[PDB]
Design a protein around this ligand. Structure first.
Ligand SMILES: NC(=O)c1ccc[n+]([C@@H]2O[C@H](COP(=O)([O-])OP(=O)(O)OC[C@H]3O[C@@H](n4cnc5c(N)ncnc54)[C@H](O)[C@@H]3O)[C@@H](O)[C@H]2O)c1
Ligand SMILES: NC(=O)c1ccc[n+]([C@@H]2O[C@H](COP(=O)([O-])OP(=O)(O)OC[C@H]3O[C@@H](n4cnc5c(N)ncnc54)[C@H](O)[C@@H]3O)[C@@H](O)[C@H]2O)c1
Ligand SMILES: NC(=O)c1ccc[n+]([C@@H]2O[C@H](COP(=O)([O-])OP(=O)(O)OC[C@H]3O[C@@H](n4cnc5c(N)ncnc54)[C@H](O)[C@@H]3O)[C@@H](O)[C@H]2O)c1
Ligand SMILES: NC(=O)c1ccc[n+]([C@@H]2O[C@H](COP(=O)([O-])OP(=O)(O)OC[C@H]3O[C@@H](n4cnc5c(N)ncnc54)[C@H](O)[C@@H]3O)[C@@H](O)[C@H]2O)c1
Ligand SMILES: O=C(O)CCC(=O)C(=O)O
Ligand SMILES: O=C(O)CCC(=O)C(=O)O
Ligand SMILES: O=C(O)CCC(=O)C(=O)O
Ligand SMILES: O=C(O)CCC(=O)C(=O)O
Lengths: 415, 416, 415, 416
């Protein structure tokens, strides 16, 4: 049964997560007794985030920090700034953290934050004030040893610096370990910046090996061209693939010869989106999903590959950079159509893997260890998929949830 | 706008509270720029409360602690165990705490807790385990100097004792100030246990003087016969009133000679409700609202006097012991019909008043004498404001309370 | 069943305390279920207290803090420095604290401290160093809101000042509420210094009314002439009584005319004890107990009125200033001889009552409220004794233990 | 002088420890002035552990946590559940932790915990409640940076999980570092679980080299077949040795061909002990000590090799898996009989060594490979000391450890 604070016909991403839980249920053996633990976050914190606007009036924004499961260790997970941030969305994101963390076996529980705001509508000062007030409000449950935030959509090294500074001033001492994804002047690295994109690239290459797809001249489509999508695209072109189609919030472009990802990155950084890129042609947004490719990389927001457009997708491999881009109804259609789907909770875990590295701590040393971690987790999940004759997503959930509920099992209930 | 985590077609009591806020808006003056602070709780904590049931299976209950506003001091407010506990309801209850605390001028912010559970369905052990797990889950935001819980619907000295012990054991030291409503053996009193009901009685008498109603012979109806309703009814009969009708969750009883509250209290204690009481007749639940009285006392749950039944009410004074029992639509109808309505946020504040006396530390009589006097003073103050602005006592109570709460916000400012 | 860390043949005062608990068991009713709580201290802390001696060598002393029961509130109770301090003794003293605190109804659990040292064998420097090391070592379980020490045998305002300072310096801030019995300069009072003796005097007068003993001309004998004994004798002489026999660790003196208590106080202060006092005749220690009196006040150490000498006693009232001066075998003998015995756990509760007054914070007003509390506590216990046909001691335990165990019952067990 | 809270005629294991300290006294040099530090634990905490039994009765158990010496670092040491747990035993166990941690040079002081309880007499629910109440009571002095418990007799990864969870719920955050010996799901390893038994095997092979004893074909007798005894016997059989006699609390078995340790471990798991094992013959308990072996491994409880049975032992090497299994009087007898005794404070330090590894953040084989190396090197260092002073390995081990502990005490000094 769903919690009374949610509406059953308005479950958003959390409704998808719950479907993914139902699908792993038959594979949990005696851990089944504990399955409801997956459907109930330990801690939901909803905080008022009031600031004085530049125009003189007071503005109130919804801030969230959800700790979904911390059986295995302190909470870990990013912070989203987006106009569509909601309780149900932050809950789902915190759950996929719990599952991805268990799946790649980092000693972290899952947590997530969000502010319901479009940062484009705020001045730089307003953005800073919102960030600091939010960090003050959630300070009561975060900390280097308790719950460690990180970037997500519309947040970045600057937002993390403001968070780290605010928490430090509040507490009275510099605490670099309270957030990851920090600027290098404060402890972070170019390693962490490209970690998520690089993980996506690595597991996409491992899947291509399985699917018999050659990376040289492989057609790639990417949704999103920010921290995850932009980096994944850069690495695939550098591997000799052709990134032939990109869609973001500003529109869609198309380049049969493959875009110059370097120039497109600079263009995205200069205008805020791919629309207007000189080295490509504009394309209707719907046509993006029908462009024939070898690999499709959803790396924008959730619920993008759905019952509605899944059948018209013509690709060999989907590699989920985004959290929850694909629904379970879509999974079924894509499988029936012979598409290999590499799940978010495996594919995008590069970020939290290096976040772990940053929390504990060449650039090549880091990356080579990450690539090892990502291949090994992929290898393991693949073996579980083969063993139980299930999709890679289900297999990922088998591995992650067995680790989560065994922790619950051993820890027990008090009292 | 309303927060995105609520639905507009499902606001519960929070919707009623927002309407009450709209009505104080014209009276805030320069503090109007802060009015949205009243519509946004500072802190919403929702916790999982898992236990193993006696039967071997794991059960998960919804737990809540909402700190609506702490501009003026630490959080203060009860914990409700009820099957219809929801986010919006605990939100509304915590907001009424902020207002009532500012109205009677105790240095507490408003907070409230809830567990979505029917205690009737739980064994005594299960109820303990639920209470302890809840307490350990919200431990991170409560404490004797931070947020202090107390009883509410279906909770009592035993539930409070369990919360206090749990918190103490988690913290590693006895912390008797972490909750109020404690049993005598842990720092509480019979004073606090009858405080809210006594506050209702005192305030109802002050109102009766204003409307020219004599207490001796006066007909009283009471919805709810628990901690608040039972004591209120008991005190009114002892003052010479006739409690002629009682409704609770088990049924409605009617007795024009006035019930023996001593015997009815005992009956509710043995059986669980007023249903089946010897000294009365059973009456249809809807009919309860139509019984002619001098004073009607809703002391059960919220949203009980509505546009559906407000025109049918025949009484001179409503004194709200319950939180949120009357909607703003009902207010308009009752006022049109010349009914005097004394708002919850004044009438039921006797509890948090003596809760303050428990937390901060004189005979019981002396303690009651100060309580009675505190309630009289706050009533007279709110009444003076009602006359000043020619508004209802509810609006005046909000004028007084929100001016205190928002001036605190104004002075504290925003950081950064 | 006694704990394994004690020896049955070597129980010391704990053995007497256990017999007292057995004597209250028939009167607990439904609270009998919890009676073992009285028999088991929540917390025993034994600490090494090493210092460097003046002679250049290292000395190790035994330090103790026992928290017997904290159901009703934070621990409260004094610290004894004495060569015969032992685990069993500190346990017993902490348990009498719990009981007296509930009998007089202050919101404190029972606790006690001790250092097995004879201060007469230490220089002032050494005594200070021992006091400070001991405070640092037990720091982890004491504090203004947790456990509040106080004086007892061979400790006083100077020991308390050192304890308070050490704790403040360890914690980084002045914390005056960490102990009671402080010097005036640090928050304390003459009211607290005389509180225990005054309580003994008050209660003694209430018993005298019950037994028809006139204070005017009454013969008083006091064992111990320290903080408790000295002050009680002083108040009784001021009330017109004759203090005719005093015994302390240095000897016994006798003065049928009644000693000048003021001069004897001065003499003890200068020489260390009553021995050699000019205004009295020396007398064998054993003969002390046979001197006929109206009121006998044991205000020294425990186990002083026993099966061996109880039959020899010729007095009308015994008022216990000391903790546990009278064994249960002695109670029975005394009972049979028509001697009224007013128990320690009522008679000496003046200290903790004004200690409470100190912990929360005129002198005449402060004493006027000490006297009212003591009379009301005495009348209440007297009522219970008559109601149940039991001794005053048993009645005091009835009142105290019903309050202690009802707090236990209500708090329950977690888990 | 012994502390007044102990009896000279009832010192238990603590008395044996003191004899051991006396034997190292001539070798301390200038650090002699601090010898009494070895004989006085910094901190003894004894706690009441009340629970409600399944039959409705309140039961009180004795809980202990003794922090013997923390000059060199945070406290580290196991928790024993046993019916003969006593103050003197937990003191002795804490002190051997101090010594072994210094001997193998891990940055931990010595501590130990226990509950005087026979787990066989409690249900699983009762055992859990005891564990949790104990953890909440000793919480005030344990923590990941303060004092980190671990397994010992009758405790294990399930007990560790419960301690960890309790401490985390009390503190309000997951704290996986508060204990070691955790299950894999909570951060523990198979390396840690086999660690002590493995270190016993490693040093046993290091002594076998010194004595020219071939592991292949060597006769082994083990007392105790739990976490230490079981894994040690397995590792020896896998190295070609024959495990010919096993004694545990249920009895003694004999098998001159060498037991299948895999099948015996399974039997012990299923029935609780070695009694009834089909693959061997029953044998009188006292005869266990007279069986001729190459290697004898006491891996049960203390005081098993004494004046009484020492002259009867026919073996080449004794390797102490247990804490304090051998008295000083037995030591002398064994030395005169040419038996080589490898002491507990070196031989069983494998656990704390990997406990350190767990607490701090390589495959399971690299973990083991590092364990093997540190154990060989610590053995070789103590051996060099023993030959330097012409003393036993036990005395040499104390020389190494006590010099390090007392130098730490010397530098830190006394405050004030
Ligand atoms: N370390 C990380 O940053 C990390 C780790 C794991 C998963 N993720 C997930 O990866 C995804 C992207 O994260 P980011 O860090 O790249 O965000 P980012 O803010 O750098 O860029 C976000 C991208 O999403 C696109 N987008 C937004 N709304 C869109 C719409 N309606 N239609 C199409 N595209 C739209 C934007 O145009 C932009 O390209 C999110 O799902 C995030 O949760 C991020
Ligand atoms: N100190 C306090 O307990 C306190 C303080 C201030 C306000 N209040 C308010 O007073 C009211 C009652 O508090 P309590 O402490 O009396 O609770 P209580 O649990 O002692 O009893 C509650 C009463 O409500 C009645 N009730 C429940 N459902 C009903 C229904 N559907 N129809 C009619 N009656 C119904 C129950 O039968 C019972 O008589 C609540 O609104 C509570 O918020 C209580
Ligand atoms: N606030 C308090 O100080 C307080 C409160 C309650 C109870 N008590 C009890 O009162 C008693 C005395 O307390 P104090 O504070 O007066 O101690 P104190 O150290 O001021 O004087 C103690 C007295 O005991 C005497 N004494 C010691 N050994 C003796 C022996 N073998 N024979 C005879 N006399 C001996 C000493 O000579 C001295 O007169 C103790 O039992 C203490 O626990 C003290
Ligand atoms: N990591 C560890 O577990 C660890 C580390 C270092 C030292 N030790 C020591 O090793 C010994 C056991 O460790 P464990 O972890 O194996 O305990 P365990 O509880 O797994 O098994 C204990 C063994 O002792 C046996 N035993 C109990 N009483 C006995 C008796 N009277 N006669 C003969 N055998 C008896 C039991 O039958 C069982 O075989 C203890 O001395 C413990 O302190 C354990
Ligand atoms: O780096 C992290 O902590 C994880 C970032 C995140 O939220 C994600 O993996 O989606
Ligand atoms: O006494 C308190 O602190 C809270 C009482 C309460 O919950 C209420 O006033 O409704
Ligand atoms: O003042 C106190 O806290 C108690 C003094 C004391 O030790 C006693 O009452 O015996
Ligand atoms: O793992 C540890 O901390 C040590 C276990 C223990 O108590 C021992 O070595 O005997």
């Amino acid at each position: 049964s769903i919690p009374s604070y949610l509406h059953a016909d308005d479950l958003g991403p959390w409704g998808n997560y719950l479907q993914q839980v139902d699908r792993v249920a038959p594979y949990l053996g005696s851990l089944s007794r504990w399955i409801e633990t997956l459907k109930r976050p330990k801690r939901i914190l909803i905080v008022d985030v009031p600031i004085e606007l530049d125009n003189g009036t007071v503005a109130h924004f919804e801030g969230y920090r959800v700790q979904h499961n911390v059986s295995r260790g302190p909470g870990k997970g990013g912070v989203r700034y987006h106009q569509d941030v909601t309780l149900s969305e932050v809950m789902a994101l915190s759950a996929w953290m719990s599952v991805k963390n268990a799946a790649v076996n980092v000693p972290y529980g899952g947590a997530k934050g969000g502010i319901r705001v479009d940062p484009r509508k705020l001045s730089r000062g307003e953005l800073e004030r919102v960030t600091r007030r939010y960090t003050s409000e959630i300070g009561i449950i975060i900390g280097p040893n308790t719950d460690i935030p990180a970037p997500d959509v519309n947040t970045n090294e600057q937002i993390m610096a403001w968070m780290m500074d605010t928490y430090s001033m509040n507490q009275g001492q510099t605490a670099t370990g309270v957030v990851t994804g920090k600027p290098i002047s404060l402890g972070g690295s170019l390693g962490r910046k490209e970690a998520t994109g690089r993980g996506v690239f690595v597991v996409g290459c491992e899947a291509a090996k399985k699917k018999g797809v050659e990376i040289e001249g492989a057609r790639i489509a990417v949704q999103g061209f920010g921290n995850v999508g932009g980096i994944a695209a850069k690495l695939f072109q550098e591997a000799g693939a052709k990134v032939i189609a990109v869609q973001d919030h500003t529109g869609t472009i198309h380049q049969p010869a493959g875009v110059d990802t370097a120039k497109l990155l600079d263009h995205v950084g200069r205008t805020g989106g791919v629309a207007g890129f000189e080295g490509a042609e504009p394309m209707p947004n719907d046509e993006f999903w029908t462009v024939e490719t070898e690999i499709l990389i959803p790396a924008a927001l959730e619920n993008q590959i759905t019952e509605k457009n899944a059948s018209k997708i013509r690709t060999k491999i989907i590699v989920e950079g985004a959290n929850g881009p694909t629904t379970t109804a879509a999974d079924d259609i894509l499988s029936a159509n012979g598409v290999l789907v590499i799940p978010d909770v495996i594919a995008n875990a590069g970020g939290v893997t290096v976040s772990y590295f940053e929390w504990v701590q060449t650039e090549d040393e880091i990356n080579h260890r990450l690539e090892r971690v990502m291949r090994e987790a992929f290898a393991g999940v693949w073996a579980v998929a083969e063993e139980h004759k299930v999709s890679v997503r289900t297999a990922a959930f088998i591995v992650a949830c067995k680790r989560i509920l065994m922790a619950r099992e051993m820890r027990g209930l008090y009292p």
